Scaffold this active site. Structure first.
Site: not given
Ligand SMILES: O=C1CC(=O)NC(=O)N1
Length: 221
Positions: A64, A66, A77, A185
């Site tokens: 998901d 942030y 991320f 993983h």
């Molecule tokens: O901290 C995260 C975890 C993830 O699955 N994906 C993101 O964009 N941010």
């Protein structure tokens, strides 16, 4: 439609879910009408699909966006260049970056350069309600990102998958030739319980070179 929103290869790749994509637009409009917010910004939701489909060589799967306002930018991320401190997941990623590649700590948390160089930073779910982690699971995104992953896997081209969303037994079937999946993983918050020392970046490049592809220049400013 799709040809308006995403790069040409992606528009063709995502044609089978063009209606699901239209439905997700209707869902986000109904969230605003219903008085709930969503991240990232609407202009950033499909941002991973605005870099060339044919040029993708590495897939990094998150779960998901942030959930913290001003963090999610439509690349898994990544954060905007003025975001400080980094989210825990990205700090952990940058610890492994410096440890694996011997580069210094990045200047900021913007992974745009990876996107430009054919690293697909894909969340399984492309929106979230602010301050409510994983609130948009089961709202229709899974079919869209599943179609993206299956399309990527179907190309002749080389691909290395890095799974940082702990859903390997769902994702590994979508991906299994010319596709190498990095196992095991561990995810960035796994930290010293398998993530640190996983050397995902150097191992992606060994696997790419071993399939007759060019390595990724992982180097961030
Ligand atoms: O901290 C995260 C975890 C993830 O699955 N994906 C993101 O964009 N941010």
């Amino acid at each position: 439609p799709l040809s308006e929103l995403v790069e040409r290869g992606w528009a063709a790749a995502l044609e089978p879910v063009a209606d699901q994509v239209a439905h997700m637009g209707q869902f986000l409009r109904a969230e605003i009408a219903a008085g709930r917010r969503y991240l990232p910004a609407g202009s950033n939701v499909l941002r991973a699909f605005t870099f060339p489909f044919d040029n993708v060589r590495v897939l990094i799967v998150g779960q998901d966006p942030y959930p913290t306002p001003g963090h999610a930018v439509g690349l898994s991320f990544s954060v905007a260049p003025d975001v400080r401190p980094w989210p825990r997941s990205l700090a952990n990623i940058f610890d492994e970056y410096t440890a694996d590649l011997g580069y210094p700590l990045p200047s900021n948390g913007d992974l745009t350069p990876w996107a430009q160089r054919g690293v697909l930073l894909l969340n399984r779910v492309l929106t979230v309600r602010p301050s409510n982690p994983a609130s948009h699971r089961g709202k229709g995104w899974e079919a869209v990102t599943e179609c993206a992953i299956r399309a990527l896997a179907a190309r002749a081209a080389p691909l290395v998958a890095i799974l940082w969303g702990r859903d390997a037994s769902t994702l590994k079937p979508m991906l299994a030739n010319c596709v190498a999946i990095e196992s095991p993983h561990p995810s960035p918050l796994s930290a010293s319980r398998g993530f640190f020392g996983s050397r995902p970046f150097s191992r992606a490049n060994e696997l790419l070179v071993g399939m007759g592809a060019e390595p990724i220049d992982w180097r961030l400013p």
